[PDB]
Amino acid sequence: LAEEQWEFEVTAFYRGRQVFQQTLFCPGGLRLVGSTADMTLPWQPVTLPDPEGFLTDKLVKEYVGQVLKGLGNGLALWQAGQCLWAQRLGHSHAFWALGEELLPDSGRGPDGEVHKDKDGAVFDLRPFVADLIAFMEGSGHSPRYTLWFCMGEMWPQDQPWVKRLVMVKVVPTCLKELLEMAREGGASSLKTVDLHIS
Amino acid sequence: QWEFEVTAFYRGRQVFQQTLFCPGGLRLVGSTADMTLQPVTLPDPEGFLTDKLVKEYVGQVLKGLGNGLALWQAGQCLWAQRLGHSHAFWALGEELLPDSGRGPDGEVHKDKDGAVFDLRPFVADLIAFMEGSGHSPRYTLWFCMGEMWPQDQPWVKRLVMVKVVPTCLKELLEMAREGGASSLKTVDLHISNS
Amino acid sequence: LQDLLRTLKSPQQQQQVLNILKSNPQLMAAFIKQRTA
Amino acid sequence: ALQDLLRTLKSPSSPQQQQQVLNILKSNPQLMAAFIKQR
């Protein structure tokens, strides 16, 4: 089986509303599903909540449920060979990109599309380590670690991400901690500032 | 007076969120406190951030708040005044995202004439929302402290962003959505076998 | 009169919702039109 | 040594959580040397 998996903080947003946030350590991999799936190891199912208890817009509630239905066997996430991988096992397409912890980038397109096969890499540790080293040298650019997934719809280019039906945020805790260690050592990303004081 | 849900963000990190009912008015101050007659003390960036340069500038912005930003209700309107050295720009948006495509709706005045929200446009937009217009009235007030409004740049890079949500207006929109009114007028569902 | 208000399992929020309802009768007519139709 | 590079928190992280950070530090002497550069 798999080994040396990473702990992830998974957060889900239904129409710009946070409905799920859990710190998951799944050593046999995890699958983000839309309904109550049977407990299977490997690939632990992680059930996203029913939008009935979090939303009141009927049309949004029906279409979010349509996206959750399209998850099927779920969005598989696993670590293998210094890299992170994502595979959609259902009918709903998924687009991914790196971004901030509270804001995916809407000015650019997605870094790629989630592969239906098993060769869909969504993160590589080599550029993260190289950017983290340069960040500690005074580059002003911190390495990105937050993985955003847009489920069922196109990536929100030039459109408020809070309008998307299902947005999932995946944060590897080991990478975030490594960036907090660099910031604790004296590094910074605050290159530009313009305070208005009178 | 109205009950407000206050939320503060330091460099794109939620560091404070409380739902308080202050009949004597709101006041968003820093560590340099002062009693004047209800103050809402924002937390120190030491126990929330690790970037040394960001914590130094957040503290400088919290210093410029002075006696803080006041906010109250009068005549079906919300009024906001600043009593410190740091400027403040406000705008309406969503609960998890201020509008960065456009500029701010104005700068926080230095006198008692705030006028950051009016109930009359909210009711007119809410009635149309229930009639089927598909546009829900916005009610989330965002405040950018000590910096220009984040226009054409990510709002999470701003030092101090404060979100104020009137709880009564939030529920009044939930009642409309529970009654059948929706805002989902466009969606291209990317679902298929291939 | 607490009838058109949702049943969700803040007392000041409830009365402030009622004050806006009674202050704008057009809001009452639109709220009633949803469930009656 | 090496463990001295980890952060000190009010609520400590579990050993298995810190193992994910140490494996990256041991597998990358280039990154581990840069952390010592900041010491």
Swiss-Prot record, chain B:
Impact when changing residue 192 to A: Decreased acetylation by KAT8
Modified residues (Phosphothreonine): 36, 41, 50
Location of cross-link Glycyl lysine isopeptide (Lys-Gly) (interchain with G-Cter in ISG15): 157, 163
Disulfide bonds: none
Changes after translation: Constitutively phosphorylated on many Ser/Thr residues. Activated following phosphorylation by TBK1 and IKBKE. Innate adapter proteins, such as MAVS, STING1 or TICAM1, are first activated by viral RNA, cytosolic DNA, and bacterial lipopolysaccharide (LPS), respectively, leading to activation of the kinases TBK1 and IKBKE. These kinases then phosphorylate the adapter proteins on the pLxIS motif, leading to recruitment of IRF3, thereby licensing IRF3 for phosphorylation by TBK1.
Diphosphoserine modified-residue sites: 183
Chain spans, region Interaction with HERC5: 1-157
Superkingdom as given in the UniProt entry: Eukaryota
Region Mediates interaction with ZDHHC11, annotated ranges: 1-194
PTM sites of type N6-acetyllysine: 163
Gene inactivation effect: Double knockout with TREX1 does not show a visible phenotype.
Residues modified to Phosphoserine: 182-183, 192, 194
Location in or out of the cell: Cytoplasm; Nucleus; Mitochondrion
SUBUNIT field: Monomer. Homodimer; phosphorylation-induced. Interacts (when phosphorylated) with CREBBP. Interacts with MAVS (via phosphorylated pLxIS motif). Interacts with TICAM1 (via phosphorylated pLxIS motif). Interacts with STING1 (via phosphorylated pLxIS motif). Interacts with IKBKE and TBK1. Interacts with TICAM2. Interacts with RBCK1. Interacts with HERC5. Interacts with DDX3X; the interaction allows the phosphorylation and activation of IRF3 by IKBKE. Interacts with TRIM21 and ULK1, in the presence of TRIM21; this interaction leads to IRF3 degradation by autophagy.
Known role: Key transcriptional regulator of type I interferon (IFN)-dependent immune responses which plays a critical role in the innate immune response against DNA and RNA viruses. Regulates the transcription of type I IFN genes (IFN-alpha and IFN-beta) and IFN-stimulated genes (ISG) by binding to an interferon-stimulated response element (ISRE) in their promoters. Acts as a more potent activator of the IFN-beta (IFNB) gene than the IFN-alpha (IFNA) gene and plays a critical role in both the early and late phases of the IFNA/B gene induction.
Protein family according to the UniProt entry: Belongs to the IRF family.
Name listed for the protein in its UniProt record: Interferon regulatory factor 3
Upper lineage: Eukaryota, Metazoa, Chordata, Craniata, Vertebrata
Residues of the full protein shown: 195 to 390 of 419
Curated annotation (Swiss-Prot), chain C:
Localization (cell): Cytoplasm; Nucleus
UniProt superkingdom: Eukaryota
Record-listed Phosphoserine modification sites: 10
PTM section of the record: Methylation of the KIX domain by CARM1 blocks association with CREB. This results in the blockade of CREB signaling, and in activation of apoptotic response. Sumoylation negatively regulates transcriptional activity via the recruitment of DAAX.
Primary role: Acetylates histones, giving a specific tag for transcriptional activation. Mediates acetylation of histone H3 at 'Lys-18' and 'Lys-27' (H3K18ac and H3K27ac, respectively). Also acetylates non-histone proteins, like DDX21, FBL, IRF2, MAFG, NCOA3, POLR1E/PAF53 and FOXO1. Binds specifically to phosphorylated CREB and enhances its transcriptional activity toward cAMP-responsive genes. Acts as a coactivator of ALX1. Acts as a circadian transcriptional coactivator which enhances the activity of the circadian transcriptional activators: NPAS2-BMAL1 and CLOCK-BMAL1 heterodimers.
Subunit structure comment from the entry: Found in a complex containing NCOA2; NCOA3; IKKA; IKKB and IKBKG. Probably part of a complex with HIF1A and EP300. Interacts with GATA1; the interaction results in acetylation and enhancement of transcriptional activity of GATA1. Interacts with MAF and ZCCHC12. Interacts with DAXX; the interaction is dependent on CBP sumoylation and results in suppression of the transcriptional activity via recruitment of HDAC2 to DAXX. Interacts with phosphorylated CREB1. Interacts with CITED4 (C-terminal region). Interacts (via the TAZ-type 1 domain) with HIF1A. (Microbial infection) Interacts with HTLV-1 Tax, p30II and HBZ.
Associated pathology: Chromosomal aberrations involving CREBBP may be a cause of acute myeloid leukemias. Translocation t(8;16)(p11;p13) with KAT6A; translocation t(11;16)(q23;p13.3) with KMT2A/MLL1; translocation t(10;16)(q22;p13) with KAT6B. KAT6A-CREBBP may induce leukemia by inhibiting RUNX1-mediated transcription.
Record comment regarding domains: The KIX domain mediates binding to HIV-1 Tat.
UniProt name for this protein: CREB-binding protein
Lineage summary: Eukaryota, Metazoa, Chordata, Craniata, Vertebrata
Gene it is expressed from: CREBBP
